[PDB]
């Protein structure tokens, strides 16, 4: 019925896709989520939105998802949409493993999902998924990697980036502090806390309010860990000590 | 916004009428039927010297005895042309005989109104074809020229023009055409008419011409054969 169809998969007069844009506005308001590549690993750090006192704490994270042995992701935007997509990512990764008997290379996993997102902008008359993702991983072709994908079905690789609230500000701070070819996990962790300290300008930064996951290699095996609150507090403490030095 | 199969108060399908307006955005093509064969001639309409002229193909062979000139939205013509080709080969396969020009034209014309959004397969045609076609060939009725437009109406014509300058070209055709006219005369006549109607100066790279004769198979004129005919014109 033509009267009620909002026509979600058509061009506007400038060659634009309005839903896609509109989905990108949803993302910009969601929890800030950054990724940082280092020489010995990759990390994700995310603002938590689940922070009311009466919440119960039952999973090992709020917005960090393990995809397969060698890969994880974080998300900004519509949570239920993110659940459908991360489920689909796990399925694609297992289909590839079944067929080839090796892990899916990171970029291939991202591309496979982005093609699904792409389809939702071109046919079927449905709303797109209101999700942007950051993907971290290791494979044998390009080692440690970080990708970003959005509701247009576009992706790229990054050394450091941010999606969600205050993204532009977070990327400026990264442009200025990030040392191409010279970062370590320990210095990326410092930078991530620096960045979240500034971009959560409402208000004072706490371990209850962020989530950090690291992805490293140990004895020929990928290790993916969500940092415990003791460690997050310790990094916050070190960042606060470090800013005391800032003048003299 | 209304559905694609909506009739106007005059009893026409809006989509078909609009498709008919798209034909006017095409280059001019001419067909003439003589007792010695048919010719088809088309303005190429070159938009840059960097474009390769031979990659503009607006006259195509359907089979050895039938050619086709198109005007309008050229990309739309491809499925029509392919259908004509498949059909003539099916007919050869099944009946061991060549298919008449009229029959080819009929078969293609039966695709015309097959569009719509809630009878058909998961992604069937959404709109009519923005193309007009002149089928020129020779069969056992003799030489023959047929015209078809996006309504699926088709008819035999002794001479016809289609595209941007078709009014114009059609008037000159009524003036010059006669039943006993030779094919060489028809060729000259249609190049004279293209020359009038074309925005650019006519030459041997910005037009195409083809013939079909009782003697001889579909033949596209070469650069050199065009130059020869261009001398007098």
């Amino acid at each position: 019925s033509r009267r009620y169809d909002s026509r979600t998969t058509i061009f506007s007069p400038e060659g634009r896709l309005y839903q896609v844009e509109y989905a990108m506005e949803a993302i910009g308001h969601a929890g800030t989520c950054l990724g940082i590549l280092a020489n010995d690993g990759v990390l994700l750090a995310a603002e938590r939105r689940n922070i009311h006192k009466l919440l119960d704490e039952v999973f090992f994270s709020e917005k960090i998802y393990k995809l397969n042995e060698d890969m994880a992701c974080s998300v900004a935007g519509i949570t239920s949409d993110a659940n459908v997509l991360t489920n689909e990512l796990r399925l694609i990764a297992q289909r590839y493993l079944l067929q080839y008997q090796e892990p899916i290379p990171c970029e291939q996993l991202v591309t496979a999902l982005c093609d699904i997102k792409q389809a939702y902008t071109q046919f079927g008359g449905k709303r797109p998924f209101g999700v942007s993702l950051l993907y971290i991983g290791w494979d044998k072709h390009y080692g440690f990697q970080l990708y970003q994908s959005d509701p247009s079905g576009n992706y790229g690789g990054w050394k450091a980036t941010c999606i969600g609230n205050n993204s532009a500000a977070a990327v400026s701070m990264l442009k200025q502090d990030y040392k191409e070819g010279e970062m370590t996990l320990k210095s990326a962790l410092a930078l991530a806390i620096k960045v979240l300290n500034k971009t959560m300008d409402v208000s004072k930064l706490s371990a209850e309010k962020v989530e950090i996951a690291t992805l490293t290699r140990e004895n020929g095996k990928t290790v993916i860990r969500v940092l415990k609150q003791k460690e997050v507090e310790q990094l916050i403490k070190k960042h606060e000590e470090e800013e005391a030095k800032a003048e003299r | 916004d209304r559905g694609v199969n909506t009739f106007s108060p005059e009893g026409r399908l809006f989509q078909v009428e609009y498709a008919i307006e798209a034909i006017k955005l095409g280059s001019t093509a001419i067909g003439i039927q003589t007792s010695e064969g048919v010719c088809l001639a088309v303005e190429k309409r070159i938009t840059s010297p960097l474009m390769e002229p031979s990659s503009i193909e607006k006259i195509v062979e359907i089979d050895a005895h039938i050619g086709c000139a198109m005007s309008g939205l050229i990309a739309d013509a491809k499925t029509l042309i392919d259908k004509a080709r498949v059909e003539t080969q099916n007919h050869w396969f099944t009946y061991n005989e060549t298919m008449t020009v009229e029959s080819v034209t009929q078969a293609v014309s039966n695709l015309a109104l097959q569009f719509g959004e809630e009878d058909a397969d998961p992604g069937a045609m959404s709109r009519p074809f923005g193309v007009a076609l002149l089928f020129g060939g020779v069969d056992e009725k003799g030489p023959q020229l047929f015209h078809m437009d996006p309504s699926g109406t088709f008819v035999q014509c002794d001479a016809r023009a289609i595209g941007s300058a078709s009014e114009g070209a059609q008037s000159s055709l009524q003036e010059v055409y006669h039943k006993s006219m030779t094919l060489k005369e028809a060729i000259k006549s249609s190049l004279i008419i293209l020359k009038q109607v074309m925005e650019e100066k006519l030459n041997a790279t910005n037009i195409e011409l083809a013939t079909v004769q009782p003697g001889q198979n579909f033949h596209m004129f070469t650069k050199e054969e065009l130059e020869e005919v261009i001398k007098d014109i």
Partner: protein, 204 residues
């Protein structure tokens, strides 16, 4: 008989706080040995292994398809799969092919990932499960295997005695079967380690 085309044998056995699982190593096609290091026992967890005998192609398919399902299971759930739950997962996979089955009859051996309690089971080719408190066997020399396990197995065996019993049960059983053998591999699964051995064995 389809099940004897490749031959082969697996078994598993329970001891005190430990389990053992073992397999012959031959990949052959009717009379012809093709290889002598063919894998039939696959990790499904740190302390959980599945052994498959039967048609080699289905041994590989079932292991691979099972792994697909288990990995999705573990990602989705909080956690490592329980032995009994693996059994049910395999049962369900085999019974989906009830009318065109995979020709394999697995055994499972492991320790509960939280309680470390020993578990062993086997299933027929259409997914009927059987848990036992002693041993299970599957392959072209099942009768031979039964005779050895019924005579030698005892309750509450420590890791060393379990290893000797499963090893002697396997070696002597496959030595009465033309199309099983060409080596034996044994995994002993304890709380704090896995011990993997290949046995001195007949090669004819």
């Amino acid at each position: 008989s389809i099940m004897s085309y490749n031959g082969g044998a697996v078994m598993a056995m329970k001891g005190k706080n430990c389990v053992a699982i073992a397999a012959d190593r031959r990949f052959g096609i009717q009379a012809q040995m093709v290889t002598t290091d063919f894998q039939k026992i696959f990790p499904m967890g740190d302390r959980l292994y599945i052994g498959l005998a039967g048609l080699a192609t289905d041994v590989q398919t079932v292991a691979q398809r099972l792994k697909f399902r288990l990995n999705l299971y573990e990602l989705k759930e909080g956690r490592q799969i329980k032995p009994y739950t693996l059994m049910s997962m395999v049962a369900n996979l085999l019974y989906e092919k009830r009318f065109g089955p995979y020709y394999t009859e697995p055994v499972i051996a492991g320790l509960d990932p939280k309680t470390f309690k020993p578990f062993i089971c086997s299933l027929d080719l259409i997914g009927c499960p059987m848990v036992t408190d002693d041993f299970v066997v599957s392959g072209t020399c099942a009768e031979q295997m039964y005779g050895m396990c019924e005579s030698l197995w005892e309750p509450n065996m420590d890791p060393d005695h379990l290893f000797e019993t499963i090893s002697q049960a396997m070696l002597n059983a496959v030595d009465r079967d033309a199309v099983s053998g060409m080596g034996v591999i044994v995994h002993i699964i304890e709380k704090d380690k896995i011990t993997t051995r290949t046995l001195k064995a007949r090669m004819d």
